[PDB]
């Protein structure tokens, strides 16, 4: 799941990612998003940020001291 | 006073305020439970809008689903209807709790949530023991113990009501959105009681399957298309059970109302619920010719 | 004018708020001696965002999407009819 999501994120593909990755057929779990979420903040792709926030991500949990320090 | 009665009716009850909570037994009679709840906790409800969602924590919040459920909560508040839900603090349940909080911040909404005692690990037995840490925080009358909820729903439907018209029977509509097996079983058992159920085909995989349905090969193809992983992981025995449950569901076509994807107007949930209740009242053959 | 009115009103409210001829006493005495709202704001923010979304969606361009869906359904029906005809023969 993680590699497929990363590949889809490499290009600006919103609807394809929503349909294929978050179809709900296979549970993805919210904690797994963190890594890719960080990349979305560096690639300057707000729509994937919206996807991650709407798909169960806890933004406050993501903004850990280490994460903010590095960012 | 009330606690003393509860001691004999049920002991081992914990009230938490940060939010009343109770310990439920299968042998517990729904009639006495409803009588006590009306006596001390809440008032008689003109309507009951139950929600069926997969017990799995994983969920997806689409904008259309969010708007639909916000409209549902608004309608429930306007009509003062009870809401029955699993209440495990995940996905749709968490969104419902947040919506209830937002509505109440801006005359009260009942969000009774029935869950399983075993499924939740933390124990905070009692007087008003309060603990933090699965359970939801925004629900008002969560209680811990499928069969119990159906029994309570049928008892409430049988109970006569002096208001809300509907032939002295409370609407008690059943609402089911999303994809799952337990939601299939809940819809089937609700249909067994003739309660009108409304479904949304926008997101729910099994909900979309049923919406598209309205033979065995067709059902298998639809569920494979909409549940590839579930179909592949599901055993051979479970396939026959699912097929029979869905076929029995399709037997009562009139009760099952569906929401169309084309509809995008503000008033969609109210129209669907009203149409379902009208179908149920007209086609029941009892006090329908009036 | 409204901006300057705010400035002057704040200036008057900020000082001792005493009549001019009787302010010396205040000077001498003072020298000698001397989240519900945020939740409501968030709810209104959500309502405002929903209103903006409704204003944007008021375009009413869904007719083309409905027509495309109807055309796809017609094509599927035609394919089913062709399959039935092939099965017959």
Curated annotation (Swiss-Prot), chain B:
Cell compartment(s), UniProt:
Cell membrane; Membrane raft
> What's the entry's take on its domains?
Cooling agents bind within a pocket formed entirely by the S1-S4 helices that opens to the cytoplasm. The coiled coil region is required for multimerization.
What tissues contain this protein?
A: Expressed in dorsal root and trigeminal ganglia. Specifically expressed in a subset of pain- and temperature-sensing neurons. Not expressed in heavily myelinated neurons. Not expressed in neurons expressing TRPA1 or TRPV1.
Q: What's the protein here called?
A: Transient receptor potential cation channel subfamily M member 8
Q: What happens when the gene is disrupted?
A: Trpm8-deficient mice have severe behavioral deficits in response to cold stimuli.
Full protein: residues contained = 40 to 425 of 1104
Function noted in UniProt = Non-selective ion channel permeable to monovalent and divalent cations, including Na(+), K(+), and Ca(2+), with higher permeability for Ca(2+). Activated by multiple factors, such as temperature, voltage, pressure, and changes in osmolality. Activated by cool temperatures (<23-28 degrees Celsius) and by chemical ligands evoking a sensation of coolness, such as menthol and icilin, therefore plays a central role in the detection of environmental cold temperatures.
Instruction: Name the species this protein comes from.
Output: Mus musculus
Could you describe the subunit structure of this protein?
A: Homotetramer. Interacts (via N-terminus and C-terminus domains) with TCAF1; the interaction stimulates TRPM8 channel activity. Interacts (via N-terminus and C-terminus domains) with TCAF2; the interaction inhibits TRPM8 channel activity.
Description of post-translational modifications:
N-glycosylation is not essential for but facilitates cell surface expression, multimerization, association with lipid rafts and ion channel activity.
Q: Which family does it belong to?
A: Belongs to the transient receptor (TC 1.A.4) family. LTrpC subfamily. TRPM8 sub-subfamily.
